[model samples]
Target: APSYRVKRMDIAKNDEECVVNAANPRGLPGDGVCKAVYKKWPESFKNSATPVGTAKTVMCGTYPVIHAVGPNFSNYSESEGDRELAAAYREVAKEVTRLGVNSVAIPLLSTGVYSGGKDRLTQSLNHLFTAMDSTDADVVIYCRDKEWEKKISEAIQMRT
Candidate 1:
């Protein structure tokens, strides 16, 4: 099984060789965690002009960043949204393995301003963990705050 670690820090500060960006179909690196990434590497989203439920990688300084677009909850059912989140996580896992990356850092896929709230966030987390658990890469979940960290910890515990 893959190992999971929860850290309270900015995703950009993570030392992992690979990082996952929670993105949109446009892959513009607009809001949430992606904004920080875009600020650091303006071209981080350059090659991410793909559909949702898929990912594209771009070089970010020294690390490889995976830009995965999860479903937009406003237009999809909760169940469909969950599936999209799972697909995003699965894509990240595949990319990690393909690139031979030993470590990766990720943010909650759809848990920002555009999220489906706590219940939906929980559901997405379940799918994310389930998909990631199948990979061997060391995964670090970057939480924005203490509350988010605690919530993710609870979700991880409940999932396991």
Candidate 2:
């Protein structure tokens, strides 16, 4: 089993080979980390117009940004949403492996202003970790700030 470790850092400042964007179905760069990525690289969301349970790569600066869309929390059941989120994470792992990129930075999916709340966010994080554990890469789950960092750390600790 290839275990993924967690780290607290700014996703943009990190020199990870791949950065995962928590996007919508239309691949629009909305609130939170996605917004920051878009502000820096405006064309990051242009590679793909819709979500397909896989990553669409866009070269930003020196690294390839992976845009993966999680489920919209409003229309689906919790279990269904979790499956979609997990699929997105799995796709990211597959993408990085295919690109031969061993380093990745990912934000907490669906934890933004448009999120499904803390419960759904917790479930999504659990799903993401499960997929990441099977990858042979250094994955960093980038937190928005100290509060988010603490929440993610607590979640990881509780999981273990």
Candidate 3:
């Protein structure tokens, strides 16, 4: 069954199938909670080829860090952040379920460096959580940063 776990912690070492990084095309870790997560789980970083897409597991960890790339902020109009995030989340969900991981952890996607501001970030997460609410894979929002934790909690409660 799909579940949502909101906690202030690191994703990589949390014993989940994989850590979700709100990364861009460069695969470089952004500031705030993402930077700390990268430091703690360096192997989780990955360069997403396309927005709303999935990549095979490359790093070694308790669970494969599934990198879901959402649309960039400036590119939101053209890319459609909500749709992109939902597609990406669904792709990862399938993989996680296939691997027998009932629960998957994720961060606030496209909030750090990507673009759409709070509205855009919330929209992306709304799409993701909508998928989580209905999917068989449990969704855990690992927010170690205070701002992220509050924002994520509010969004999740408001929408899902």
Candidate 4:
């Protein structure tokens, strides 16, 4: 079924069709999810910056890695971070549609040390829900730790 659910799992172990890596504009190897993505591809970029809300695809052996760059509130003003976060989700949706993928494993974008809180995560989820509204792919969100497992799951149910 094509639905959204929060799961406690390692995204690296997921053999699903598509996986989204919360990437930076540079498209380089980053900490957390991006680092795991690098482990599979270990490739370099040709562009200097990919910009927020833009999605890029690259071959990592079998399936393509959707690099969706979300807002980095760590360095930007909180106000701007909000909108960029929404756009990032849209960018991800755009990529998902382009590939016509039926399923995708996703990690919460701009959470943890970057956005660093639960407040925006619900808003992030809202943005994700809106972005994903037009797609057919099933979304399974992977949060590595225990904190967001229930938090995000609650948000998902509340939105219904």
**Model number with the top lDDT:** 1
- Candidate order by decreasing lDDT: 1, 4, 2, 3
Look at candidate 2 and tell me the lDDT of residue 15.
Answer: 61
Listed per candidate, the RMSD to the true structure in angstroms reads 2.8, 3.0, 3.7, 3.0
State in Å the error of residue 119, model 1. Answer: 6.0
> Candidate 3 — which residues are off by over 4 angstroms?
12-14, 28-52, 71-81, 116-121, 151-160
lDDT of each: 0.68, 0.66, 0.58, 0.66
Higher-ranked by lDDT: 2 or 3 = 2
lDDT of 3: 0.58
The sequence of per-residue lDDT tens digits that candidate 1 reaches over residues 44-137 is 7665565656677777667788877674444567677667667767888888878777777767756545554443556557766765776677
Residue 6 in model 4: lDDT: 77
lDDT tens digits by residue: candidate 4, 1-160: 6677778767777445787776667544454477775665566233424566466777665777777667444566667766766676777788777788777777776554455544466555766677779568776777766876788777777777
Q: Which should have the higher TM-score, number 2 or number 3?
A: 2
Give residue 141's lDDT in candidate 4 (0 to 100). 71
Report clash pairs, candidate 3.
Answer: 3-138, 17-63, 73-115
lDDT of 2: 0.66
Q: Candidate 3, which ten residues in sequence have the lowest lDDT sum? A: 46-55
Q: In candidate 3, what are the lDDT values of residues 96-145, reduced to their tens digit?
A: 66666666676666553555344455555666666565556666766656
